[PDB]
């Protein structure tokens, strides 16, 4: 699935600490579970924040620099030693008995996929007039955008959609495509570009009733 | 005497009869329009979407 970064941002807590960074939403929650000592005040003091500024692309592990004091390569941090990272000296204590960095551990510590853009879609019940603005991401199929409206009407399901494809005609939508695919473009880059407000207009889908019993 | 029995028939027929009459006829005429008034209510919908 995906998600918005409000979306991500709604669990920051050493309860539920979520991350979103390289395209990637983590629960790292176990980790700040087992690990709970200076090394993860770092990511804790940023739950449910953007971390794709601690890694480079290239590599998925954090950046890397020579160190002034020692002359020797290691991890940017910043903000500090977050968990699997080595300590600058010799110690006697960071085992490396453990399997993979958490950067690199994707299978047990990552859940859906982060959205490169959202966009506003306004959603219109046509039988009871109730207009309701909403962000979804720009790229899912009508299936999850229904998903999202489902917590505006609990029976959503037996509503059918229906937006102004093109001239221009209110027509019906499949579901398994999404919101570029079924003719509903997006152009808030050509709003900003051209200095017309994102809130100017907004793309619109109906919402009509299907009879059920 | 005689004409008697001839009123009493004719009365019963017309009066039984119109009083059949004009019921049933009020009463098609009270469903019908509420079937109408159901119709108009939809149609008044209809047109309402339209504008919308």
Redesign the interface.
Known sequence: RYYTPYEVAMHNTPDDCWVSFLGGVYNLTDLIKANQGALAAPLIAAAGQDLTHWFDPTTKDPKRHICPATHIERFYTPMGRFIHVPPPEPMCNWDTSFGLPWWRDAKKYQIGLLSARTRVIRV?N?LT?QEDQIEVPCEEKLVEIRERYLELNAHAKSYTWKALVRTHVFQELDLNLTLEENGVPDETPVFEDHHVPTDYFIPVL?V?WNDDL | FEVEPILEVLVGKVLEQGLMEVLEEEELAAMRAHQEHFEQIRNAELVATQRM
Do not use: K
């Open positions: 219109r046509v007039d109906h009509y």
